[PDB]
What we know:
Chains A, B, C: InterPro entries: Macrophage_inhib_fac, Macrophage_inhib_fac_CS, Tautomerase/MIF_sf. Three copies of one chain form a homotrimer. Chain A contains two helices and seven strands. By secondary structure, chain A is α/β, with parallel strands linked by helices. Chain A has one domain: Macrophage Migration Inhibitory Factor, CATH 3.30.429. Chain A has a four-stranded mixed β-sheet with strand order 2-1-4-5, covered by helices on one side. Chain A has a two-stranded antiparallel sheet with strand order 6-7. The two termini of chain A are about 15 Å apart. At the A-B interface, β3, α2 and β5 of A face α1, β2, β6 and β7 of B.
Amino acid sequence: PFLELDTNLPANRVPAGLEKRLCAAAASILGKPADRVNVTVRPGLAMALSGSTEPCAQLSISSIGVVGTAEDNRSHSAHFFEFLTKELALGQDRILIRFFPLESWQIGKIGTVMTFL
Amino acid sequence: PFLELDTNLPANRVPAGLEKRLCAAAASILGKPADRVNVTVRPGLAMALSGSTEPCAQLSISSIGVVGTAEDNRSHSAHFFEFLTKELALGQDRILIRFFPLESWQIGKIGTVMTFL
Amino acid sequence: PFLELDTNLPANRVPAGLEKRLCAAAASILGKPADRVNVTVRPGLAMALSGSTEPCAQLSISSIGVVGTAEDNRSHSAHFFEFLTKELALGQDRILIRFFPLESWQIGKIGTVMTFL
């Protein structure tokens, strides 16, 4: 999985080691081995979420197979909201997630694509 | 809508409050309520646009329903170019936009997905 | 083409002028004129790749026509891995790429969309 988190929290208000805890949480939630989970955090950005520049965060989650239905994503969303609200000290109205299915021919890994591994 | 703006302008050359003005402009252009508009600005990046590292900006716009045709996007592009050229003091050859349709099952909101709200 | 590179290398460990060399490399690899190539580098991020927070980089490549098959992307991946491993002093296990086909109606250019140019 590929997780990307943009926030207007400054880096010094994003708890140390968030990327590592998010990586482990994602592995558990999405049912994927932790050595296949990728996390990118981009703090200190200028953001409006739902029209408001109060602290907020946007999460993007991309994966093969497991983020392509409403019913799967409803479950995933609940868990990721729980994780981020606590970590970032945000209410649920200050987080949004976007889910993006991927296919193996899209993933370049060790100089080839996942199709051939 | 979800707008993401990457620029090689340093943060101190991106006018204060851009994210708020872009949020209001997007609401007007895309015909969506301002409390559904999201904007993320990432300044100070290293960028080449059309082969050149002169100041520039890349905008991504994602939304349900309204960014999926050439004729819709032609109109949207004109307006967003007008907005950004003035705000960022850029010529039109230094901005590019990418439009991405989204579906409700992709949007995690308040711990569920938009499908169920 | 639109290339986006996220890294946890600090900006002062990303060689000067990387964005320019990546732009020229991409033009050669993807067979596109260099004045149509776009590169964005976002350094100093907090990242885990394959579960690990050691230095790493994620590259996204978006283009019309040339990134939509496994066999095309296998070739592209080899070249981009070669480029980035050397530039960033990373092993191949510390880089991942994602390929995203685009269509002309998605690209806002000079106030219109590529469809009409």
